[PDB]
Design a binder for this molecule. Structure first.
Ligand SMILES: Cc1ccc([C@H]2c3c(C)nn(-c4ccccc4)c3NC(=O)[C@H]2NC(=O)c2cccc(C)c2)cc1
Length: 370
């Protein structure tokens, strides 16, 4: 098959795909990008359709099998390589980019393609003076000039690596990044399971970030790392998260935490975080969340947000598992409910648990009015 990666085995193992895996990151399951559009792989837009089945249909045509929204890294590379071919075709019919592209060695061409993936042809073509420097092989001067750009300010760590690639014509920046992340991961990894960071590594991670392990900030990090389950941090999660956060160091991750916290001031992002917490907290082997665990995470994530949290605890501690829908709807309840619960709609198909809670809160609500 034309797309078989075996056709690239004559190349180096470092390539544009591995470069963008580092710089942009790789998603092997369909997800919604920034504009809400179904995407997979390295930034491969599947469709602007709101229909996930439409996205899966586009993915199956592109991959050539029934994927059900999940692909392998190799399949993602094949998708990416098609996108690279298209980007190269575009470069080559761009009067402003073709001269420099033709002039560049293969590694520096990858750096230019990286730029085109990030900012598009018109964006890259705006770098007239730096592109001339590159075309003249004035590498250090190009590097200096590119670093003065807004590009650098937007994505300093990626941009630094791309610039280094222009400067050196080598993959050093990517080798160095990979090694940095490997060596940081190795600081935290479970001595008995190379594939995860365990409790002790998470403790060390928190210590290195000067975070109380029981703080919401730690759960916020897990959320940004799309961690699957509490008390584990898989190698994939760690690497993917550091990539997506643009961090290759603990200092950089530390500087990112307030930005993740700031993201939560958006109710839509807080809802995402809130819903994330359910699957994260739940035992993988279980379909629902143990009430005791639910209470613990509710108190972490809803304290200060859910005005009846204290009554909710009292209610639940008198109760003798929580399904995802009930977890989710508690936030909806929290958002709509009047300070005295007078606007509860019993016919709103709330969980029975919430119906019962509204009934339970009656003595307290009556006492307060008294
Ligand atoms: C040292 C350490 C701190 C926190 C935890 C969990 C945990 C546990 C076991 N109770 N727990 C909690 C529950 C309610 C209130 C307060 C804390 C939490 N709060 C979460 O962030 C938990 N976070 C993770 O596992 C986890 C996974 C992947 C990446 C990252 C960065 C974290 C375990 C170990």
């Amino acid at each position: 098959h034309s797309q078989d990666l075996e056709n690239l085995y004559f190349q180096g193992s470092m390539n544009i795909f591995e470069m963008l895996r580092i710089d942009e990151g790789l998603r092997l399951k369909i997800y919604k990008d920034t504009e809400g559009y179904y995407t997979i792989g390295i930034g491969h837009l599947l469709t602007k359709s709101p229909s996930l089945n439409a996205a899966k249909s586009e993915l199956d045509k592109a991959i050539g099998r029934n994927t059900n929204g999940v692909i392998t890294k190799d399949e993602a590379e094949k998708l990416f390589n098609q996108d690279v071919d298209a980007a190269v075709r575009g470069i080559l019919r761009n009067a402003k980019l073709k001269p420099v592209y033709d002039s560049l060695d293969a590694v520096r061409r990858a750096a230019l393609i990286n730029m085109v993936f990030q900012m598009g042809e018109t964006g890259v073509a705006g770098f007239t003076n730096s592109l001339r420097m590159l075309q003249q092989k004035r590498w250090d001067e190009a590097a200096v000039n590119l670093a003065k750009s807004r590009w650098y300010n937007q994505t300093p760590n990626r941009t630094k690596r791309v610039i280094t690639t222009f400067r050196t014509g080598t993959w050093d920046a990517y080798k160095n990044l990979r090694k940095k992340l490997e060596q940081l991961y190795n600081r935290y990894k479970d001595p008995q399971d190379e594939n995860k960071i365990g409790i002790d590594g998470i403790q060390q991670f928190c210590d290195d970030l000067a975070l109380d392990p029981a703080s919401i900030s730690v759960l916020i990090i897990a959320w940004k790392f799309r961690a699957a389950t509490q008390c584990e941090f898989s190698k994939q999660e760690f690497m993917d998260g550091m990539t997506e956060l643009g961090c290759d160091s603990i200092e950089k991750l530390k500087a990112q935490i307030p930005k993740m916290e700031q993201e939560l001031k958006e109710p839509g992002r807080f809802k995402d975080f809130y819903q994330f917490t359910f699957n994260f907290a739940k035992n993988p082997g279980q379909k629902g969340l143990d009430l005791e665990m639910a209470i613990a995470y509710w108190n972490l994530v809803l304290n200060g947000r859910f005005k009846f949290l204290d009554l909710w605890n009292k209610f639940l501690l008198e109760h003798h598992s929580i399904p995802k829908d009930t977890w989710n709807l508690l936030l909806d309840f929290s958002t709509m409910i009047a300070d005295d619960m007078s606007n509860y709609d019993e016919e709103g198909a709330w969980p029975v648990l919430i119906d019962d809670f509204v009934e339970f809160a009656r003595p307290q609500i009556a006492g307060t009015k008294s």
